[PDB]
Design a protein around this nucleic acid. Sequence first.
DNA 1: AAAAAAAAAA
DNA 2: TTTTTTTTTTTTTTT
Lengths: 362, 362, 362, 362, 362
Amino acid sequence: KQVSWKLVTEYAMETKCDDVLLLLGMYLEFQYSFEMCLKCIKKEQPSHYKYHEKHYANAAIFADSKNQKTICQQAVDTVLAKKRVDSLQLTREQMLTNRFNDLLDRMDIMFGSTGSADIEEWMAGVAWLHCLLPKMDSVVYDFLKCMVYNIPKKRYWLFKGPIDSGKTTLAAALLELCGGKALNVNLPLDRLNFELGVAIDQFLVVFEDVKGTGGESRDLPSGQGINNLDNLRDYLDGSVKVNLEKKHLNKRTQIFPPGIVTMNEYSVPKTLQARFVKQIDFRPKDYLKHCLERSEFLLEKRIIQSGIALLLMLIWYRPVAEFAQSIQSRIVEWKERLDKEFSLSVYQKMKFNVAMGIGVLD
Amino acid sequence: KQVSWKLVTEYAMETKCDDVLLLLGMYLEFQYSFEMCLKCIKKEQPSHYKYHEKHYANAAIFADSKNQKTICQQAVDTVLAKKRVDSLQLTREQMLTNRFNDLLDRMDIMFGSTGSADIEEWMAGVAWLHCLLPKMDSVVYDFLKCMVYNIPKKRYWLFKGPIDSGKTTLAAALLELCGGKALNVNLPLDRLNFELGVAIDQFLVVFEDVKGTGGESRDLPSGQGINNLDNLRDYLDGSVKVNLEKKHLNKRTQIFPPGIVTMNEYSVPKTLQARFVKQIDFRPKDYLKHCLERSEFLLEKRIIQSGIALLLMLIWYRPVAEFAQSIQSRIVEWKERLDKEFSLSVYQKMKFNVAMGIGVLD
Amino acid sequence: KQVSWKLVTEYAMETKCDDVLLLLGMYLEFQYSFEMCLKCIKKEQPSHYKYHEKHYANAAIFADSKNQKTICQQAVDTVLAKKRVDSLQLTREQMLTNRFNDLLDRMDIMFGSTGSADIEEWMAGVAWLHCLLPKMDSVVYDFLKCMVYNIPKKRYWLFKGPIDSGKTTLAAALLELCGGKALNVNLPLDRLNFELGVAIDQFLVVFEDVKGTGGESRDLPSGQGINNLDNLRDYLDGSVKVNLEKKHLNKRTQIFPPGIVTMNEYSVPKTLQARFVKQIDFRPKDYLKHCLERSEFLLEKRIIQSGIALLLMLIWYRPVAEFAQSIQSRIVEWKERLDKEFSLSVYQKMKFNVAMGIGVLD
Amino acid sequence: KQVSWKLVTEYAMETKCDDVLLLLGMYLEFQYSFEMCLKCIKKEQPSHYKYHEKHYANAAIFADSKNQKTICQQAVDTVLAKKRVDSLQLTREQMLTNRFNDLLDRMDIMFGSTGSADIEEWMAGVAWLHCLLPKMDSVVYDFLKCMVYNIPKKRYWLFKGPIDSGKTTLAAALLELCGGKALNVNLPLDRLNFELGVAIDQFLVVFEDVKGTGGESRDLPSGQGINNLDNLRDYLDGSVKVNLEKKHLNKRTQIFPPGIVTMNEYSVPKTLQARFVKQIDFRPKDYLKHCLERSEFLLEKRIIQSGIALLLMLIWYRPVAEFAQSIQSRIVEWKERLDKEFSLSVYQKMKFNVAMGIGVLD
Amino acid sequence: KQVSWKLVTEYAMETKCDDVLLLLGMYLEFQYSFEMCLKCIKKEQPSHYKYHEKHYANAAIFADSKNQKTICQQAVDTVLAKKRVDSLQLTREQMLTNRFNDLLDRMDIMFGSTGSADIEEWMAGVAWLHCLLPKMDSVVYDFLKCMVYNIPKKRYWLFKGPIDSGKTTLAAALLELCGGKALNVNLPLDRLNFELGVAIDQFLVVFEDVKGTGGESRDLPSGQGINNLDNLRDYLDGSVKVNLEKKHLNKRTQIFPPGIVTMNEYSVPKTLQARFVKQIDFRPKDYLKHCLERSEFLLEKRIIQSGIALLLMLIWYRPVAEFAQSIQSRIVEWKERLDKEFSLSVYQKMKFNVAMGIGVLD
DNA sequence: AAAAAAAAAA
DNA sequence: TTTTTTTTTTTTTTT
Ligand SMILES: Nc1ncnc2c1ncn2[C@@H]1O[C@H](COP(=O)(O)OP(=O)(O)NP(=O)(O)O)[C@@H](O)[C@H]1O
Ligand SMILES: Nc1ncnc2c1ncn2[C@@H]1O[C@H](COP(=O)(O)OP(=O)(O)NP(=O)(O)O)[C@@H](O)[C@H]1O
Ligand SMILES: Nc1ncnc2c1ncn2[C@@H]1O[C@H](COP(=O)(O)OP(=O)(O)NP(=O)(O)O)[C@@H](O)[C@H]1O
Ligand SMILES: Nc1ncnc2c1ncn2[C@@H]1O[C@H](COP(=O)(O)OP(=O)(O)NP(=O)(O)O)[C@@H](O)[C@H]1O
Ligand SMILES: Nc1ncnc2c1ncn2[C@@H]1O[C@H](COP(=O)(O)OP(=O)(O)NP(=O)(O)O)[C@@H](O)[C@H]1O
Ligand SMILES: [Mg+2]
Ligand SMILES: [Mg+2]
Ligand SMILES: [Mg+2]
């Protein structure tokens, strides 16, 4: 009998696997019998125990075949092909709704009876993260609105601020919440081709700590960063399609994703400042440092970096009327699940702990 | 039963897919039965609902295929072969007619019964642009004739005037209607050689924001860009063939594309002045400034800077006999729509409001 | 009869063979008859004599084959796929526990009765290593804990000090203890793209003897390494995923590993200093140099830079409760071996000999 | 009948071809009828006449074959695979013992009755080389131990001195004796990567005539070589595994070979000097110049550059006990041959001839 | 009936064709019937009419092939394989003797009845060349000896002298006589790798007009050549195998070819001067310029640049016994032909004519 | 352009 | 399953 390539493509789509070697490794683990399988008995990874019995028969034949990597390439290209169809067809609010919906599935396994997370720790993160900027919850709502409306020229946000000031923590959470990629532009411009190529079919890009000019008086080293961005004006404004190249593939023409530039106290050119909508001035808070020092779990579990933490903040602070209609049915359940867990009293006490630089949970 | 590669090539040709994964992705959507598929029921995307019912039977056999990427590569290379044949063998009248009737297809999508756009805003965009210059439709129509005839020396147009005079808006609108790209001759003469390579196989080029030399006596930032351009005599004149150098690729010979120079009120050396057939003095108009602050939706959906807005202006103002004989039958239909949806009093009232600095569309 | 590709994949898996030429070379040694093989008779290498008798039948058919490198590539792909599955599925503590089990297997062979190694020479290395830094067992345990707790921005350690101070020595031992790659950032920034790709799925990276600027008056040659490390700040932070590259494979997107920077008294930017949670100042001790001159086996057998020396140090100094549950079984066995072989009296004489700068075995 | 791919691989293994075109070329010579063949009648090249009679039947079928370069590729990859297995599995003294067996096999051809070479001329080369440095045979043995022990940081020797001092002469001899590659690090840092990949799986490297800076006070032109080496001090240490790159292949992680740096009286950094365990100061000797111009056969036959001359120096000067057990049998036999053909009176007169500047054979 | 790949390989080997497209083109024009072939009737190119009548049958089948470049690639790789075998296994005197035979074959064609050359014009070249430099035939014979012997560091010659002194005239003639290529070391140093890769498997190189610095006080342009050449000391030495690089190909290890350096009167560093054996001072001679102005056929037919003019000079002036014994047979019949057509008094009149700037043939 | 890695033919 | 044909990148160029 012969390997069904469709079952492998179905598994790859079901688990959304776009790495050929991960797909090979995952599928090969199905060749052992399910009735004696320790991974299915422990229920470690859902990407195994859901699929093993279904794919066992195909995986035994797959394990004997001579072109295993060809089978996996096609399945991976099917997943990359669906992403390109979705990227070119879907309305941009449906992109964010699909990303929210994926986070909400991922949340339900995190905090479930088979879970391994404490909502009180993650809500202590929400409280800490809301302290970082004045009216952070409203600021995240009009950031999300900005990225959905994607108005040409008026597409990008600038996060300036000192060393250890929280711009990479917020940008990392917004990156996870909106579902983007982080890009490095401090390299020479002709290495930048394939790196800009990673923005292909993504929703946000974050340009992480772009280095400027004139920083030497402040011990801030100079680099190619600002000069690359100020050449890439064709990409930031989105007025036209620019062409993104990636291996084994034709160069996609697309309007480059919107997003976030994160920057230290470099001077920014007048030509470049014209293309950022809003500048958030991050600055270090004395109390927040002591709060984390007395609350190690925030950093160890990466709570303050997480889009799940910012999503929990949007459950708490914004009306249900703001969410997409197909997901409102999930949002109102998670509303009552936070209402049934945190009183406004405990939240205000733990937020006050942050403001005092006391341990948030005290 | 066999997969017909001819049917995939036929879908690719009708849809004009350059991209292997986009073609792979969309063709795999047809594998599901048309009897109940929601994308056909909803009729959201024409690239699916028009084609699924005839490609279903081939898509079922394609979805089982082991060759899938190879099939799509041949189908893509057929569409690229068609482009290279047309690029060498079409006349410029046909090249513009193909971009026009492509835009008429986009208009038929935007303003259809399943539409997503309202013509009242677009006609307000027409009225705004039309007020920007005296006899704007003649300016646009005569520019199109220049680009279509590509007459040596009578080949480039100069846009100059104060800061925020609209020069770059009209250049951006003309770029989409004709097809073309923006070039930056302000560069040092070293980098200019790779910058000019952008012009290969473009129908049109715009020189953006030429920073002239002598004008800083009235605080125009001094630059070399005008004297760089003055040296490029054979690129402007379009008599002889020039050698154009994309970085990492070997030099192509062609007649350099026609174009627009967008400039501030700098002094021009007389031999560079002789190479522009028309100089248009853009000037800032207070009532246009007030109207933009009041009709502000035009800037958000970017109607003001689109080729379809200029094509709507040509359909409104110009007689059908000026359009290419094969597109005339579609211009007939679009004139009747634009008349029946807008009595002249409505457009006149809009143009009056714009002239009065009143943003309301009435 | 035909070659079993499955058996080659089993050999590659059991040998954990990443290299196609190493797999080809080793499997071809099995084509000879095991009844007379000198390497089975002599038991020189375990990757031969454990496996030859099983694989002889298959290897004789493989030796006639025309596919040979294709067979080995699929087997190597299976080993790499297992590494990517484990990388994404396993906890970082289980990764470290698996590495310690690997070293204990190797220690059991190495210090067996067949073993070539003398435990008294290796504990003399543990004595020398413990004299390098104050509280080195605490420093080693703190480092392991820091690499397992992949805490964002608190990920990297800086080793600073003069020539022959012990930075590379300890880094090379920690590199073998945890598993990882040494990267050279002193080379120019364009081909640095493929160096950083060597960190794909690794547990640590060590940035080795990176070169700064200034300090030429101290007779330190300047170089790019620190400026290159002040780029790539997002690789050091690990708050965000970064895109890593192998030839002909597509980009892999992951959090870049934690680890160590070693440098020779250059001026670190404050931007880069903020990425390092600990700076260890290494300091030349003449008694350690004189000890090595009189206990040369430490250098010749590479004892003082081996991960097995640091593991023996942790087995000596740390309580069993600090090791993971799986390996505690094996570590009580190694503790009772060391306490049988060494009383504390032999070891305290070794440390006295090291502090005296005489031969450690005197 | 079909071509045996095995016999081509067996030839490649016996003749040790790294090169696909050399293997193809050699094997196609075996097409022609063995009985008549002029190369076997002359016995000109041993890689022909030892193998043609055996391979003729296979080579006739190979010459009709349609995939010849594919056959030779697998044969070459088998030879490269054995070379990688040997590099990882052999002790470093076994490696040198193998190389000595290969040189002794070449000496058995050179000085047998078929051989083109006169040992009287080669022993006059031993006489000339022994006069170059004090206690040269001790220096050669000390170098061989250093390369065999491969002690971290104690691995590189520096050869230093003026024009025509003898550095490249002794470096080329030691390179042939031990086996290895010479590298030009004077070429710029961006081409340097593929140069260093020539050291993959080699026993020595020689960094030939590297250029420093600040030599114009001596008319020594400055260059990049010493600054390039100091960027590679990670590679000279040999504590950690460096990642080596040859075109299209992914990086191989190995310990960089031990070796020699030869340089002409430039100043060397302290950081780089710490990587050199011994510095040999070469002084030019007037009598060696006058000896060579009257002993021209030494330069024409490349005798003083040869590893066979250094091996004859070790056979003459070193005790039998210093050679590896396996070759002591052959070394005893070669000692008896040299004592038979050379009295000590002939040899000590040769050294007297060298010191007087007389022709060695007078 | 099938295409014989063997007959295509015979044709390639008999033509010595190593260009795949040239082989494809040459073999395809055999597909037309021999009996009416206009190229055979006109005897235009010898590579056709000799081979067409035997290859027609196979070329007809080759025309219907689907794999034509695959066939040609194997035939080209066979010719490259023979060149590489001959490169490693021929003695250099045989290599030169092969080249002289190839030149004598060209001479037979040029001066035979089907030819197009008059020996009196070519012997006027010999007279002109012998007047260029004192004892010119000894100089050429000494150069041939130098290139055949290839003595390390005693194997490059320096041609030095002012503008228009004969340097490139003689160097080009010597380069056609011996075979080899010219190199332009004046490039920027990063392009230099692919210049030097031109020397792979070559017999000579000529470094053409290397430019130094500090000739500007004598109106010589400065350049990078001499400094680049001093980075390549180990290439000029020829003691060690250097690593040579063609584009997209891995590094060949070989001893770099011996050769000539040609330069204007720049000052040479002693490190580079020590690599040259003989410096030949070329001077402008009034009588050679006046003579060429009258005897223009020497320039117009490229006679004085040609190795065939130098080979005739060796046939005239040198004893038969200096030629390798294989070619002595052809050299004696060429001496007899030259003694026939030239009296010594005709040649002495030519030398006397050129000594006075009268036309050689007057 | 040439090779290394990958896919189609019979 | 045996054997031959195909895609694609890297490299190079660029900085
Ligand atoms: N505003 C803040 N005040 C005090 N501590 C903070 C603040 N924001 C973040 N932190 C701490 O700083 C660490 C790093 O935050 P991060 O987002 O990387 O700062 P940053 O502004 O990006 N620094 P940099 O990347 O160097 O410009 C976090 O892990 C917190 O421990
Ligand atoms: N006539 C106008 N007067 C004032 N503002 C205008 C006018 N036309 C467009 N704008 C606004 O200015 C921007 C577009 O003008 P733009 O085309 O860039 O002018 P320009 O002549 O290119 N300016 P500059 O780049 O300074 O030479 C948008 O924000 C418009 O809302
Ligand atoms: N603290 C120490 N005191 C004295 N000798 C030492 C010390 N540490 C190491 N050594 C010796 O120095 C050699 C190299 O140590 P290593 O760790 O490479 O130094 P380092 O700090 O990296 N110096 P460098 O790499 O040149 O900046 C070892 O092989 C020992 O012989
Ligand atoms: N010690 C010596 N005294 C005199 N002549 C020597 C000596 N050593 C070598 N030679 C001669 O010099 C030639 C080149 O020797 P070589 O080893 O290349 O010199 P070197 O030290 O490398 N000089 P350089 O490479 O220019 O810095 C040999 O072929 C001998 O003819
Ligand atoms: N010795 C000579 N005296 C006078 N004229 C000569 C001499 N040799 C050559 N010529 C003429 O000069 C031309 C150029 O000779 P060529 O050998 O190319 O000169 P060169 O020295 O190589 N030039 P350059 O490389 O620029 O310094 C020849 O074609 C002759 O016409
Ligand atoms: Mg170090
Ligand atoms: Mg030298
Ligand atoms: Mg010249």
